[PDB]
């Protein structure tokens, strides 16, 4: 096969491709982090009642667990994602902050 040219080496991975992956990962992170927080609100809400509903606590605990644990894989995903992106790049800056707000 004919080869031996220069495709012109760039720094960092392809931004266009990785940013597309960023969009969905951050999407997943947001949607889960939302209900993860929202569930803690619910647990506290019902736990502050002298007589909390036993079905409602199960409802909350379940959706809480899923999002909470998944936030782990979503976060560790984003951790390496932003680590390959320049901080001058808008996404890289905000993703670091959103992960910082989460736990990192």
The string of DSSP letters for 39-104 reads: HHHHHHHHHTSSS--HHHHHHHHHHHHHHHHHHHHHHHHHHHHHHTS-TTSHHHHHHHHHHHHH--
Question: What is the chain's percent helix, strand, coil content, to nearest 5?
Answer: 75, 0, 25
Tokens standing for residue 85: 């992106």
Contact 102/67 with Cβ under 8 angstroms? Answer: no
93 in Cβ contact with 19 (< 8 Å): no
CA distance 64 to 56: 12
d(CA 37, CA 17): 30
Q: Are the C-beta atoms of residues 92 and 98 closer than 8 Å to each other?
A: no
Break the chain into its structural domains and give their ranges: 18-102
- The secondary structure element, H or E, covering residue 17 is helix 15-47
How many C-beta neighbours within 10 Å does residue 74 have?
23
Residues with Cβ within 8 Å of 19's Cβ and at least 6 positions away in sequence, in order, are 85, 91
- Residue 31's nearest CA partner among 66, 62, 59 is 66
16-32 exposure pattern, b = at least 16 Cβ within 10 A, e = fewer: eeebeebeebbebbeeb
φ/ψ bin of 99: left (φ > 0), alpha (ψ from -120 to 50), beta (otherwise)? alpha
Are 61 and 44 a contacting pair, CB within 8 Å?
Answer: no
């Amino acid at each position: 096969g004919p080869l031996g040219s220069h495709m012109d080496t760039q720094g960092s991975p392809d931004l266009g491709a990785v940013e597309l992956r960023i969009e969905e990962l951050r999407h997943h992170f947001r949607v889960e982090h939302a209900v993860a927080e929202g569930a803690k609100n619910v647990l506290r809400l019902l736990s502050a009642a002298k007589a909390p509903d036993r079905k409602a606590v199960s409802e909350a605990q379940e959706k809480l667990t899923e999002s909470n644990q998944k936030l782990g894989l979503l976060r560790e995903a984003l951790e390496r994602r932003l680590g390959e992106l320049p901080a001058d790049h808008p996404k890289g800056r905000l993703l670091r902050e959103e992960l910082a707000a989460a736990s990192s």
